[PDB]
């Protein structure tokens, strides 16, 4: 029973980390590609 819920958990919280996990990556590998103030903000 908790079983299931926490395996529906775990599936609802996958699909949500990649996408910002991804983005903040993609931010970091844009500052370390072009050293700029913006960059560091963003």
Same mark, same amino acid.
């Given at each position: 029973?908790?079983?299931? &819920?926490?395996?529906?958990? /775990?599936?609802?919280? !996958?699909? @949500?980390? @990649?996408?910002?996990?991804? &983005?903040?990556? /993609?931010?970091?590998? !844009?500052? !370390?590609?072009?050293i700029?103030? @913006?960059?560091?903000? !963003?």
């Open positions: 029973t908790i079983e299931e &819920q926490a395996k529906t958990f /775990l599936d609802k919280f !996958n699909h @949500e980390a @990649e996408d910002l996990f991804y &983005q903040s990556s /993609l931010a970091s590998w !844009n500052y !370390n590609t072009n700029t103030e @913006e960059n560091v903000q !963003n």
